[PDB]
Amino acid sequence: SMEQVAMELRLTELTRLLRSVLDQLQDKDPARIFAQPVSLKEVPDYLDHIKHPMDFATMRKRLEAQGYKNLHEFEEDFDLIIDNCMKYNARDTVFYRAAVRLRDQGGVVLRQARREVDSIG
Ligand code: NA
């Protein structure tokens, strides 16, 4: 059906916008602290602590499968990256501080993305 096609084209355009958002967020992490999963071979107890690990590579895989149906889903995954880091790492660490800074800087990017998704439909 043509209605199915139109929904597919909308998902594709959202995916395109979310790619640009993901690139912009990742630019705010030049140290690449959040680029890849935590290795369970190097914080071996990680999964006793953190139930839903998340990272930018994992988000990118979901995005390339058009796996985010709306901006809220994408934001939830970004917030997991931040939130997991602020739980596992103490307030005095470079990791926790990097999460705070990414949150602050990412807020700006996400604020405009919400306006563009609403505005374009
Ligand atoms: Na903590």
From Swiss-Prot:
Crosslink (Glycyl lysine isopeptide (Lys-Gly) (interchain with G-Cter in SUMO2)) position: K41
Expression (tissue specificity): Highly expressed in testis.
Compartments where found: Nucleus; Chromosome
Taxonomic superkingdom: Eukaryota
Domain spans labelled Bromo: 9-113
Subunit structure: Component of some HBO1 complex composed of KAT7/HBO1, MEAF6, ING4 and BRD1/BRPF2. Component of the MOZ/MORF complex composed at least of ING5, KAT6A, KAT6B, MEAF6 and one of BRPF1, BRD1/BRPF2 and BRPF3. Interacts (via PHD-type zinc finger domain) with unmodified histone H3. Interacts (via PWWP domain) with dimethylated and trimethylated 'Lys-79' on histone H3.
Function according to Swiss-Prot or TrEMBL: Scaffold subunit of various histone acetyltransferase (HAT) complexes, such as the MOZ/MORF and HBO1 complexes, that acts as a regulator of hematopoiesis. Plays a key role in HBO1 complex by directing KAT7/HBO1 specificity towards histone H3 'Lys-14' acetylation (H3K14ac), thereby promoting erythroid differentiation.
Protein name: Bromodomain-containing protein 1
Organism of origin: Homo sapiens (Human)
Gene label: BRD1
